Amino acid sequence: KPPNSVLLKKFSKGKILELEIHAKIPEKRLYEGLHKLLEGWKQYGLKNLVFNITNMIITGKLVNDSILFLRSTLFEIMVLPNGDGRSLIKFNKKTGSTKTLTKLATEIQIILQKEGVLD
């Protein structure tokens, strides 16, 4: 099986954030839950969500009410293996704000802990 550094090549051009979220469930189960989580979180300020389990990637847009300048943050999320029964999450910022994308990561991490799946 290929290393994570190779799997990460599936991300589009962008800035891969240094942060990692570690889960104590395997990647397929983590991905399915993230899919359920985000598809049901449009009220967060999320649009254009696209899911692809075959590559473990989620793509989408963080929006906001800027009236003049477009300030949306286009992003990708990838779920990767992290050892037997474990996985991790990486974030890729295609456009927009690193802080905004990081806020999303933080909110996801919080949910994972409340659900008892954070490593």
UniProtKB/Swiss-Prot annotation:
It is found in: Bud neck. Transmembrane segments: none annotated. Belongs to the protein kinase superfamily. CAMK Ser/Thr protein kinase family. NIM1 subfamily. Involved in regulation of bud growth during cell cycle and in septin organization. Plays a role in cell wall synthesis. Interacts with septin proteins, primarily with CDC11. Interacts with SWE1 and NAP1. Present with 538 molecules/cell in log phase SD medium. This is Probable serine/threonine-protein kinase KCC4. It comes from Saccharomyces cerevisiae (strain ATCC 204508 / S288c).
